[PDB]
Amino acid sequence: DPEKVLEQAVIDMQEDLVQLRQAVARTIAEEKRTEQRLNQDTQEAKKWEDRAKLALTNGEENLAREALARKKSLTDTAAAYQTQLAQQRTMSENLRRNLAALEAKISEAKTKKNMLQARAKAAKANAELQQTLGGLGTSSATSAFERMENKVLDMEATSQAAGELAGFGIENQFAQLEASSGVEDELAALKA
Amino acid sequence: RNLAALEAKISEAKTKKNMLQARAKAAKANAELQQTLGGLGTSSATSA
């Protein structure tokens, strides 16, 4: 589901920056190591030259030229690794900007993601409320009210239906009552 | 405003509902009494 995928992408970015941080460690490891190499190399060059310089005056001259050839060969190795160092340096700062660029991407993606979810979730909640408030076209609570109101109207009808019979015998009987009723009215005329 | 509108709907629905039930229940009770009083057409106590 998109909710799950979306936060998963956030989680992925957290792994990514961690991977890039060690990758930084790997490149920097070679900067350190290649400093170490040049530092050694420059010593080695001097050292055997020093042996050779005494060897000029002392015993075998010829042997000193061998030591110098070894020295010089190694000097070439150092210069070759100086070439490699240049590649390291340039690549390193390229990687530094690439991390910063990714960090910007992540930062924006995360903030956008958060407000995207929030404003969407808020909107749907509002819509659910307006629907349930409104009942546009039809609203079931009124239909339930109506059902029991139909029963009221039925009972109302039925109640006056008992009245509909209740009247129609009585007129015979009532006439006898009214004769008696007139008598007490005649007693009032007597008292007057 | 939508809450206030609903609150009005609820308030009226409830008061209407209450008096609807009461007046209906009162009416049926009256009708039951008038029937049992009257025996219009026939009345079993007179038959006994």
Numbering used by the authors:
A (entry chain D): 24 to 215
B (entry chain D): 120 to 167
The authors write:
A prominent member of the PspA family is the vesicle-inducing protein in plastids 1 (Vipp1), also known as IM30 (inner membrane-associated protein of 30 kDa). Vesicle-inducing protein in plastids 1 (Vipp1) is critical for thylakoid membrane biogenesis and maintenance. Vipp1 appears to have two functions: in membrane maintenance (that is, during heat or light stress) and in thylakoid membrane (TM) biogenesis and/or remodeling. Vipp1 binds to negatively charged membranes and membrane binding depends on stored curvature elastic stress.
By analyzing ten additional unique structures of N-terminally truncated Vipp1 in the presence of lipids, we show that helix α0 is a major determinant for the types of polymeric assemblies that are formed by Vipp1 and that helix α0 serves as a membrane anchor for Vipp1. To obtain more insights into its function, we analyzed the interaction of a truncated Vipp1 lacking α0 (Vipp1 (α1–α6)) with membranes using cryo-EM. We found that, in the absence of α0, Vipp1 forms PspA-like rods that are not capable of membrane tubulation and apparently do not interact with membranes. Membrane tubulation of Vipp1 is largely mediated by α0, as truncated Vipp1 (α1–α6) assembled into helical tubes that did not internalize any lipid membrane in the lumen. Although it has been reported that truncated versions of Vipp1 lacking α0 are still capable of membrane binding, our micrographs and cryo-EM maps show that Vipp1 (α1–α6) does not engulf membranes in the rod lumen and does not assemble on membranes, while it may still be capable of binding lipids in other conditions. Moreover, the truncation of helix α0 also affects the assembly state of Vipp1. Additionally, the monomer orientation and rod symmetry differ from the rods observed upon incubation of the full-length protein with membranes while the Vipp1 (α1–α6) rods adopt a SynPspA rod-like symmetry and orientation and cover a large range of diameters. In the PspA-like Vipp1 (α1–α6) rods, however, a register shift and a larger distance to the next layer of monomers would make it impossible for α0 to reach α1 + α4 of the monomer in the adjacent layer. Thus, the presence and absence of α0 coordinates different assembly states of Vipp1 and interactions of helix α0 stabilize particular polymeric Vipp1 structures.
